[PDB]
Design an enzyme around this catalytic site. Structure first.
Site, PDB file in Angstrom:
ATOM      1  N   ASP A   1      43.411  41.570  45.296  1.00 29.34           N
ATOM      2  CA  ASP A   1      42.659  40.519  44.523  1.00 29.34           C
ATOM      3  C   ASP A   1      41.754  41.293  43.473  1.00 29.34           C
ATOM      4  OD1 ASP A   1      43.318  38.774  46.316  1.00 29.34           O
ATOM      5  OD2 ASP A   1      41.637  39.010  47.570  1.00 29.34           O
ATOM      6  N   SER A   2      42.482  42.198  42.723  1.00 26.59           N
ATOM      7  CA  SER A   2      41.633  42.680  41.617  1.00 26.59           C
ATOM      8  C   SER A   2      42.847  42.399  40.139  1.00 26.59           C
ATOM      9  CB  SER A   2      41.649  44.292  41.626  1.00 26.59           C
ATOM     10  OG  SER A   2      41.211  44.768  42.781  1.00 26.59           O
TER      11      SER A   2
END
Ligand code: MG
Ligand code: ZN
Ligand code: ZN
Lengths: 364, 193, 55, 357, 59, 145, 80, 56
Positions: free
Chosen positions: A117-118
């Site tokens: 989730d980056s």
């Protein structure tokens, strides 16, 4: 509770000659969703929990929060300079102003910095004003009726001045509009007759602000009080949360220069690099269909309607790519920007509408 | 710990020369394999209709202990389960050597087989508390779209569409009901323990 | 801006749409084993309401 | 002749389109081409590694010194800039990214705009007036950029607009060339319109084994004078070459100090027959690191190890070499590698002067 | 038991409720093409009612 | 992190298993022991290597996640869509130029010698020789037909 | 608040043609509609007109990013 | 009112995009925030005087 509703006109035409299923009303499917959920394109192709996530994240997005922002003194409000209509728009954009950009997103593993989730952002995209705007805070300092007054305090006849602060910036009791306030600077002078005790105001924030507008209005009891508006020049930076309309939110983890980002054979390079591993469990398919549709919209020169519950055919949308000169899968031969070496795999890259969520790292 | 980091860099430095991606075409069935899924689903619905026609003639006799309602719903729940052969049309459409959605699932990096089936082939029956959608819209209706005492499997949460095909309004609502349950139970995760 | 908000103490406030229970209707719920309540209102949206409970 | 076949092609406006013609006519009285046009340049390189060609491309993108227009501190007059929406941040970002083709830093411009009418008035770049420096015989930017707009009655005064020098690696307003093409001409390709191959890159060799030495590189320069296109492009290419040489020569003055204790060169004798050299250079990039690794490897095919690292959070390039010679012999080989790099790029610059007429 | 008073009003109103499930089956009394099916109780009793007053299970 | 524009706490993705963390906006606390006694026990007792094996379940906590799992598969995969999964000496060397271990010796390799993916992994696993034999997650009887 | 000076993604000078592109675009759409009231022209129908050839006539390349940002960027002078 | 026969209505070409105009009309008549102001107008026209006079 007395109604038998056909969920769409297709269902009503299906049962047109069916005496054993007599509808009282016919529905328009998009009517089952709110206005925030109608922002998301192809929302019926996404697992609905992520549509809920977007409905939470759509209101959290930065943008043109009001058209009268210069005439306001707000607390923690963000104005984003540049905004774009989505390449794949929905009906909700007939009624709300879009707040986002059509970022070119590459769905690829690139060094491991977009894991979990980056995203990897283009530093050039950041420098040019992508998701850049200005952030506003307000201050309200009052006085007492003939006990307290505004004014640059003097260390000789005023007691209990704040230790180690800067009092020089004051002119006629206020720092002038247009100067940089620092940590420890005194931003509103204030003296109080008893000789004096120093009830001054200091700027206790980590990042320097600038006095945007100061005024001396009257309160409800007709008393002059100090009003300061503080502005911040906020670019996108490492730790800021972005999100697509499908609810795939992520923290900017790395920013690469132009020459370090990947580039296709035609020189197309991403603004965001998102991990392919964010898709399969979240089942956010409307983001992938949006990239496929929006990739041919850009070359065709059009903006199309991707509202939920409209008839779609991903097979025909992928053939629309091949007719526009691209591959069926929308993938391209791509090179590593650091070494100049081509990947042994076509990379899926194209325009996906992204938003900046108002969770600033500098505030936390 | 030093070897996890070191093998992590060999893995990451390989992919920076091999590449890895997932596209929209990784989730798309062949037109021939789309017909194979529709055949499998019609078999699920045909076996579900056979139970209903037994209910019409009163031919459903429960065991010693179960009522007719709970035996009818058990028969329906099991007759609307996807056979293991549902992966024939999925695996016929994809190339395991290049498909990035398959390789994330198959290597255990991310995802699962039901996720691949839901995206590509079909979602199937929504089960909440290991039970179908119970009629809570006024005594024998599950939604305003379906008549009272409806016997079709769609009326109780059977989704014939995959995500890649697009759900309809009743199917989206049933999936929304299923998703909201998981959020609520995850909200009880913090408080109860 | 559509408007539809209040300005109080220089701030902007919105009155929440409140999910209230329908009036003039009998609501039945479960020593006391059942409870049937009723909140009558004599006509209009602003009149005073008198609640009655049959247990 | 390391590279041949340059193809230079400016991006021109089509006035055969009636709509574009009319809009240009009644916005800017424009019936001719703009003074500064984008130029697409495609060059073929032969007998050269992609470390060198891609280093040249990276330099021409954002590691070559370039010029932009900036506003000096305090030049934005908050007093007579009565407009509320055209904040200093917005206008500064607008002005930083106007492409300029400037020949001295002395020029200073000013923007004094007044809206004394009843309609919103748009501020273009033709409203920037040169206030300091020698008078421009040719414009340094196009007059068609929408700098801003003013509400009725408002104004925008910006003084001290000067020319700032930098590199696009630090701020993107100094980027020069945009990527338009990169390919290897000595690797064969599949037809990737077929759905059998549409998941592969298209090249018939894996990038783990291929060693291409024939490349086509196409870059677009965003603002070049029309009567001097060849003169501008050539200049750019030469500067790129020289920039690389300069950086390489910096490492060249480190190897020669391998007797003196230096913080940028560390030497170990791993065994009685092995030697390890580590060169750490601050604020270096993959350009020089990759060039050094490639040419060291070509000089020493049987090297035990050569590698480099530019970790993003460390702002440095660390080059590690492990070889089966002494420190004298290893340093001799390193100097030979660097001399080969410098010779390659001197040849490139000579061919630049020979090709572009 | 059921079918008698626990659902008598509902059963008599069934042929007129438009939200009830219809069955493609002919009627013996009025010779109508369709009938209304209701499935009441936990034993899932099926009743075919018609607007003419026809009722299965001798009603 | 001496870059002044970075305000985040950065950590390796394989360390998130200790904290059940991800990078969707999580926040974490950090304090640096200033006392000598608190500094000694931080390093000897509370180092994260002590939590590599779970106290709850007695098994390991850390490993590859999402990119080194699918990247270790691709690296050790026998056949690539381009044929055999091999790399030349330069690219085999380039896999190690970041591991921060001692680089292996590639002296017995010509520039045109091809190295298998397993050969390169074996170069790293020789530091801590273990014995392992299981079937991979790749082999599933579900997919076999 | 305007079409950016350069493409956000690659940095090509898209702004030097922005003003013209705006005005031309408007005229082009008035050709394809046939003289309708500004509100009787639905928003969804004005966006389906293909601007590919117009943008090519401006001299802008066939890059996805440049045309995306040129076509979809909202002008503040039309919202205030 | 006696409406026309239902068997002679032409709808076989109603696309599912034609049906979004109904949502457009519903939102336009309703207004995004429509009732919140109607309630206040009734409060300032029929509400406040009756509650002040006929209640105390
Ligand atoms: Mg989290
Ligand atoms: Zn009958
Ligand atoms: Zn671009």
């Amino acid at each position: 509770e007395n109604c038998l509703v056909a969920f769409s006109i297709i269902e009503l035409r299906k049962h047109k000659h069916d005496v054993t299923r007599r509808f009282t009303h016919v529905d328009v499917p998009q009517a089952i969703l709110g206005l925030a959920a109608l922002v998301s394109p192809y929302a019926n192709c996404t697992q609905p929990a992520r549509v809920t996530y977007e409905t939470n994240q759509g209101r959290q997005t930065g943008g043109w929060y009001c058209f009268s922002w210069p005439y306001r003194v707000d607390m923690n409000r963000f104005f984003q300079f540049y905004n774009e209509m989505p390449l794949v728009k929905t009906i909700a954009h007939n009624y709300v102003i879009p707040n986002g950009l059509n970022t070119i997103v590459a769905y690829m593993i690139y060094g491991g910095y977009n894991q979990e989730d980056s995203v990897i952002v283009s530093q050039s995209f950041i420098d040019r004003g992508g998701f850049a705007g200005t952030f506003y805070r307000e201050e309200k300092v009052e006085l007492e009726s003939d006990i307290e007054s505004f004014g640059k305090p003097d260390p000789l006849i005023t007691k209990n001045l704040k230790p180690g602060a800067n009092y020089e910036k004051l002119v006629d009791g206020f720092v002038p509009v247009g100067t940089v306030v620092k940590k420890g600077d005194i931003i509103i002078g204030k003296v109080a007759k008893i000789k004096y005790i120093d009830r001054s105001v200091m700027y206790g924030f980590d990042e320097p602000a600038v006095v945007d507008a100061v005024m001396r209005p009257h309160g409800p009891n007709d008393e002059i009080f100090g009003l300061m508006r503080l502005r911040y020049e906020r670019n996108l930076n490492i730790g800021d949360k972005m999100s697509s309309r499908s609810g795939n939110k992520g923290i900017a983890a790395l920013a690469l220069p132009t020459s370090d980002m990947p580039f296709t054979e035609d020189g197309l390079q991403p603004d965001l690099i998102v991990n392919p591993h964010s898709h399969p469990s979240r089942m956010t398919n409307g983001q992938m269909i949006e990239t496929t549709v929006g990739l041919a919209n850009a070359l065709q020169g059009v903006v199309t309607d991707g509202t939920a519950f409209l008839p779609i055919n991903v097979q025909l949308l992928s053939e629309r790519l091949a007719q526009e000169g691209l591959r069926f899968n929308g993938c391209q031969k791509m090179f590593n920007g650091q070494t100049g070496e081509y990947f042994d795999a076509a990379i899926f890259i194209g325009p996906t509408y992204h938003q900046r969520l108002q969770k600033f790292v500098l505030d936390d | 710990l030093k070897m996890i980091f070191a093998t992590q860099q060999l893995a990451l430095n390989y992919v920076r020369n091999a590449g890895f991606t997932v596209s929209t075409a990784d989730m798309l069935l062949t037109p021939e394999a789309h017909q194979e899924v529709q055949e499998i689903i019609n078999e699920l619905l045909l076996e579900s209709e056979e139970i209903n026609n037994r209910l019409l003639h009163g031919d459903i006799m429960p065991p010693i202990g179960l009522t007719t309602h709970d035996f009818y719903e058990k028969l329906q729940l099991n007759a609307l389960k996807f056979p293991d052969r549902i992966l024939k049309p999925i695996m016929n459409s994809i190339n395991p050597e290049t498909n990035g959605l398959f390789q994330m699932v198959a290597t255990g990096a991310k995802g699962s087989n039901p996720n691949m089936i839901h995206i590509m082939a079909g979602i199937g029956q929504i089960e909440i508390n290991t039970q179908r959608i119970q009629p809570q819209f006024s005594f024998g209706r599950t939604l305003v779209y379906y008549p009272r005492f409806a016997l079709e499997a769609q009326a109780y949460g059977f989704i014939c569409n995959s995500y890649i095909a697009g759900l309809t309004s009743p199917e989206f609502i049933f999936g929304e009901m299923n998703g909201r349950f998981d959020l609520i139970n995850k909200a009880l995760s913090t408080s109860s323990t | 801006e559509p408007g539809g908000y209040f300005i109080a103490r220089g701030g902007e406030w919105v009155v929440d749409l409140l999910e209230n229970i329908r009036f003039n209707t009998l609501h039945i719920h479960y020593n006391e084993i059942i409870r049937g309540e009723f909140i009558s209102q004599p006509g209009g949206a602003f009149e005073n309401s008198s609640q009655i409970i049959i247990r | 002749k390391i590279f041949q076949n340059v193809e230079i092609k400016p991006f021109l406006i089509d006035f055969s389109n009636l709509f574009i013609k009319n809009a240009a006519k009644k916005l800017f009285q424009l019936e001719e081409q703009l003074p500064l046009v984008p130029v697409n340049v495609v060059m073929d390189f032969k007998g050269i590694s992609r470390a060198a060609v891609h280093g040249l491309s990276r330099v021409l993108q954002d590691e070559i010194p370039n010029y932009m227009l900036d506003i000096k501190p305090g030049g934005y007059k908050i007093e007579d800039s009565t407009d509320l929406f055209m904040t200093e941040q917005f206008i500064r970002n607008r002005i930083n990214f106007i492409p300029i083709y400037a020949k001295n830093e002395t020029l200073v411009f000013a923007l004094r705009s007044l809206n004394n009418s009843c309609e919103v008035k748009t501020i273009y770049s033709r409203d920037l007036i040169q206030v300091a420096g020698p008078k421009l015989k040719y414009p340094i930017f196009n007059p068609t950029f929408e700098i801003g707009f003013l509400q009725p009655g408002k104004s925008l005064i910006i003084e001290d607009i000067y020319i700032k020098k930098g590199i696009g690696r630090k701020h993107a307003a100094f980027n020069l060339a945009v990527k338009t093409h990169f390919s290897h001409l000595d690797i064969e390709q599949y037809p990737t319109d077929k759905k059998e191959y549409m998941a592969l890159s298209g090249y018939k060799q894996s990038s783990m084994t291929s060693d291409p030495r024939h490349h086509r590189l196409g870059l677009c320069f965003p603002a070049v004078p029309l009567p001097h296109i060849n003169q501008a492009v050539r200049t750019y290419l030469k500067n790129a070459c020289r920039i690389i040489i300069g950086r390489i020569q910096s490492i060249q003055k480190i190897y020669e100090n391998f007797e003196e204790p230096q913080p940028e060169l560390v030497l170990f004798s791993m065994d009685e027959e092995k030697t390890k050299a580590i060169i750490t250079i601050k604020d270096e990039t993959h350009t020089i690191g990759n060039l050094l690794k490639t040419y060291i490897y070509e000089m020493i095919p049987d090297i035990s190890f050569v590698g480099y690292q530019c970790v993003p959070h460390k702002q440095e390039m660390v080059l590690t070499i492990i070889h089966k010679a002494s420190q004298e012999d290893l340093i001799t080989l390193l100097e030979k590698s660097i001399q080969n790099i410098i010779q390659t790029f001197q040849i490139l610059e000579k061919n630049v002067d020979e090709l572009i007429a | 038991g059921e079918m008698e008073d626990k659902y008598k009003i509902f059963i008599k109103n069934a042929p007129f409720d438009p939200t009830n499930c219809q069955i493609k089956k002919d009627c013996p009394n009025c010779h109508l093409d369709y009938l209304t099916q209701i499935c009441i109780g936990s034993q899932k009793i099926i009743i075919l009612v018609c607007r003419c007053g026809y009722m299965s299970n001798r009603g | 992190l001496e870059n002044p524009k970075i305000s985040t706490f950065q950590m390796n993705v394989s360390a998130c298993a200790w904290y059940n963390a991800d990078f969707d906006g999580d926040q974490m606390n950090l304090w640096v022991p200033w006392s000598v006694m608190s500094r000694v026990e931080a390093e000897l007792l509370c180092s994260v290597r002590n939590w590599f094996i779970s106290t709850k379940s007695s098994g390991p906590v850390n490993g590859q996640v999402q990119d080194s799992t699918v990247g270790s598969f691709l690296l050790t995969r026998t056949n690539t869509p381009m044929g055999k999964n091999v790399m030349n000496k330069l690219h085999a060397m380039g896999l190690f130029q970041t591991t921060q271990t001692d680089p292996p010796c590639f002296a017995n390799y010509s520039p045109t010698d091809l190295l298998d993916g397993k050969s390169v992994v074996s170069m790293l696993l020789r530091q801590t020789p273990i014995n392992y034999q299981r079937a991979p997650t790749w082999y599933s009887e579900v997919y076999a037909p | 608040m305007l079409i950016p000076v350069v493409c956000f993604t690659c940095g090509f000078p898209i702004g030097t043609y922005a003003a013209i592109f705006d005005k031309a675009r408007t005229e082009y759409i008035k050709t394809k509609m046939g003289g309708t009231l500004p509100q009787n022209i639905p928003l969804d129908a004005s966006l389906q007109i293909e601007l590919k050839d117009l943008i090519t006539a401006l001299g802008i390349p066939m890059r996805v990013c440049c045309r995306t940002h040129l076509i979809t960027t909202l002008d503040y002078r039309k919202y205030y | 009112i006696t409406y026309g026969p239902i068997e002679t209505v032409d709808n076989e070409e109603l696309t599912e995009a034609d049906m979004l105009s109904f949502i457009s009309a519903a939102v336009n008549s309703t207004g995004l925030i429509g009732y919140n102001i109607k309630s206040f107008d009734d409060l300032m026209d029929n509400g406040i005087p009756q509650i002040v006079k006929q209640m105390f």
